[PDB]
Write a protein that binds this DNA or RNA. Structure first.
Lengths: 70, 70
DNA sequence: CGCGCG
DNA sequence: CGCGCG
């Protein structure tokens, strides 16, 4: 009856996988689309990087790329 | 019914003002010596630094010395 | 303001 | 793990 963070994780993963290898996005942009708090978006983005689905580039703010192996 | 920001500020300010000239303390130490969450301790420490009561030296964890004015 | 942090 | 961030 409850959808913890897993549904957020799934929404974010689906979004990043839709990116072109050459494109990138940010937490603020993602938060804006999925209408979710940037904090929630970040909690998933960093977890997703641990799974190698996305790659973060320490820009200001960080830019997120889909793993090019995809 | 709860010790608020302003009140924790006073508690932290007193501990820091009781340090000898060149000795420091850390947020976790104050957290332990007192019965307050580390986050709440740091919230006060950085404000105390803005007020020139304490001085922070980066390290892990950050060291907090009494400002020489005191 | 980069912050994800338990 | 540095985090204080409203």
């Amino acid at each position: 009856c409850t959808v913890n963070d897993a549904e957020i994780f799934s929404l974010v993963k689906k979004e990043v996988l839709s990116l072109n290898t050459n494109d990138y996005t940010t937490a603020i942009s993602l938060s804006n689309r999925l209408k979710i708090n940037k904090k929630k978006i970040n909690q998933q983005l960093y977890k997703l990087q641990k799974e190698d689905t996305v790659k973060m580039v320490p820009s200001n703010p960080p830019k997120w790329f889909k793993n090019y192996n995809c």
